[PDB]
Write a protein that binds this ligand. Structure first.
Ligand SMILES: Cc1cc2nc3c(=O)[nH]c(=O)nc-3n(C[C@H](O)[C@H](O)[C@H](O)COP(=O)(O)OP(=O)(O)OC[C@H]3O[C@@H](n4cnc5c(N)ncnc54)[C@H](O)[C@@H]3O)c2cc1C
Ligand SMILES: NC(=O)c1ccc[n+]([C@@H]2O[C@H](COP(=O)([O-])OP(=O)(O)OC[C@H]3O[C@@H](n4cnc5c(N)ncnc54)[C@H](OP(=O)(O)O)[C@@H]3O)[C@@H](O)[C@H]2O)c1
Length: 537
């Protein structure tokens, strides 16, 4: 049925993660024939494929789920910060309540897409030779696309167990008493470090740049306290769409230097205590916008983290006097006992800032000054390539015949962070030029989801064949993306530290930095007239 060799649908969705599950939901309400092409065999996105030791949410319950009444009605969590196993069981519950799988074609890897302007339809080709033709094309393909491993020829030779964090196997590797390595101190590294520290015989963490990690206030939830709150879950889900990063909190109405030295200490203690990303996006409104303001947030962070690390050498490495970059310039890691792990005599932080990893060997890995380390298990928690999402990665072709990969070689150009000029009736959720990485995933998805479902609703009512963003509209959006980011302390091409900079492409801000509320207003302005689109009946 959904696996037919030439598939006729109104809507083709790529991905069965949050983005694809919510898009499918919205399409069913419009009464359109829709199908998800999913590369994998189950729904959940990153929560199925890209799981690793001690992986779980950094968003607090009930922030990280769908606002769909019927999905959370009889659902509760065991804890306020669930892990990947809890999330997997949540997606089973969403499938049991909505029957998502009925409209999925699994092991469907999209390798090509071209829009036939005369037909007014996408032809969407899978790796295994099937093709769907659809009026509307929705890409819920995620941002954790293109796992980044640096140029280490040796990996082939290494005798031990090695994987990138996002490719860690389902079947857990017993690391108890083994020599393990973690390369990277992003959320992935930090999460794995907390998981391996307690059990590994020896463990080495290879740190170029330290994580500016903030405390996770994890606790058990009862079914009772949750069922009690659900009176106002609807209001809560609406409140996150009013909040800068789409959590149940946003910026303090005050800037750093409206408060005294005592008032700051107390206010910052309160955010630290309360936990989550309050320190990141419930802090003084100007700390991401002014250097002196940033430094005050940094120093307090430095004080709190130093209290937890015994060795003065590790103290300096894990929380330096001089910031490696402005505080909160990248989504920090929500940690539980990261800093405690480096107090263990089996754990060892290695400074590679000036002494790069040259290559892997048979035994383990080797550095610039010729230092070698022998290992049994290595997790490569290096970056992703977020120059763009998995949008360039599925052979999307414009109506000018060029690939999106090609048209985006000098930098990404979307309109409203949901559409691309030369890709008519093509929509993306949780991708470039959306709140995306500066946001609660499910919040941004629902804002964007509702806009795509309205956009599609309007095209059906007004009798529109296709809409296509103008280069003028896309350039103006790019100008906006850059105007919001350039006010901030976010890295620029002139910055000494440019997190996730790559040889291939130029470095640029990829997310909308204006907040969920101003974003919602921007995208809402353009309906129902489709301002900035070529309209064809
Ligand atoms: C361990 C972990 C924890 C996280 N915790 C949080 C958190 O607490 N808060 C937060 O805000 N964000 C968090 N994130 C980020 C997370 O990626 C997003 O919040 C969200 O899960 C993305 O949903 P999505 O559906 O947009 O993407 P994904 O979940 O990545 O789904 C994309 C889907 O597209 C499919 N696909 C890709 N390419 C193709 C193709 N060519 N053809 C067909 N199918 C294709 C994939 O197989 C996948 O099913 C976390 C990520 C990880 C890995
Ligand atoms: N837990 C989560 O919520 C989660 C999970 C997955 C992804 N994400 C998102 O997607 C991104 C990926 O997160 P991540 O934790 O996997 O990794 P990351 O934050 O992208 O950082 C990877 C780490 O690897 C280091 N590194 C990169 N190349 C290296 C090299 N050649 N040699 C040595 N070290 C190297 C980086 O150092 P430098 O800092 O010096 O470059 C960095 O410490 C994040 O920005 C995050 O927002 C989030």
């Amino acid at each position: 049925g959904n696996y037919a060799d030439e598939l006729d649908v109104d809507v083709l969705i790529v991905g069965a993660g949050f983005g694809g599950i919510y898009s499918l939901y919205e399409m069913r309400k419009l009464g359109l024939k829709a199908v998800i092409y999913e590369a994998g065999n189950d729904i959940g996105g990153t929560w199925r494929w890209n799981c690793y030791p001690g992986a779980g949410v950094d968003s607090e319950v009930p922030e990280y789920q769908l606002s769909i009444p019927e999905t959370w009605k009889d659902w509760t969590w065991s804890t306020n910060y669930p892990n990947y196993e809890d999330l997997r069981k949540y997606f089973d519950h969403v499938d049991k309540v909505l029957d998502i799988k009925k409209d999925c074609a699994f092991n469907s890897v999209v390798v090509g897409a071209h829009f036939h302007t005369v037909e007014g339809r996408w032809h969407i080709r899978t790796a295994d030779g099937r093709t769907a033709r659809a009026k509307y094309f929705i890409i819920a393909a995620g941002f954790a696309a293109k796992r980044y491993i640096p140029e280490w020829p040796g990996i082939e030779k290494f005798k031990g167990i090695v994987h990138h964090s996002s490719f860690w196997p389902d079947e857990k590797i017993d690391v108890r008493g083994k020599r393990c390595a973690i390369i990277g101190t992003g959320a992935s590294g930090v999460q794995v470090t907390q998981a391996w520290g307690p059990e590994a015989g020896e463990l080495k963490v290879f740190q170029r740049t330290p994580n500016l990690a903030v405390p996770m206030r994890k606790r058990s939830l009862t079914v009772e306290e949750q069922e009690g709150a659900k009176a106002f879950y609807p209001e809560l889900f609406r409140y996150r769409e009013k909040c800068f990063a789409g959590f149940l909190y946003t910026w303090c109405e005050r800037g750093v230097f409206e408060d005294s030295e005592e008032e700051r200490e107390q206010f910052l203690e309160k955010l630290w205590s309360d936990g989550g990303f309050r320190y990141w996006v419930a802090n003084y409104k100007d700390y991401l916008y002014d250097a002196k303001a940033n430094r005050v947030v940094y120093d307090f962070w430095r004080k709190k983290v130093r209290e937890r690390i015994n060795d003065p050498k590790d103290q300096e490495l894990l929380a330096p006097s001089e910031p490696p970059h402005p505080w909160g310039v990248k989504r920090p890691c929500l940690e539980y006992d990261y800093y405690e792990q480096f107090n263990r005599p089996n754990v060892d932080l290695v400074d590679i800032k000036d002494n790069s990893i040259v290559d892997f060997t048979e035994k383990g890995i080797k550095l610039q000054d010729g230092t070698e380390y022998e290992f049994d298990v290595v997790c490569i928690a290096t970056g992703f390539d977020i120059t763009t999402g998995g949008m360039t990665s599925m052979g999307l072709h414009s109506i000018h015949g060029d690939s999106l990969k090609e048209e985006w070689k000098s930098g990404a150009f979307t309109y409203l962070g949901m559409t691309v000029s030369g890709y008519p009736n093509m929509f993306h959720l949780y991708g470039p030029h959306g709140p995306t990485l500066l946001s609660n995933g499910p919040t941004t998805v629902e804002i964007q989801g509702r806009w795509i479902a309205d956009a599609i609703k309007q095209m059906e009512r007004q009798g529109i064949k296709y809409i296509n963003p103008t280069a003028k509209a896309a350039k103006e959006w790019k100008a906006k993306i850059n105007e919001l980011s350039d006010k901030t302390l976010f890295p620029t091409t002139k910055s000494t530290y440019m997190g996730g900079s790559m040889p291939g492409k130029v470095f640029e801000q990829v997310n909308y930095a204006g907040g969920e509320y101003p974003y919602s207003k921007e995208i809402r302005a353009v309906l129902p007239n489709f301002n900035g689109f070529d309209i064809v009946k």
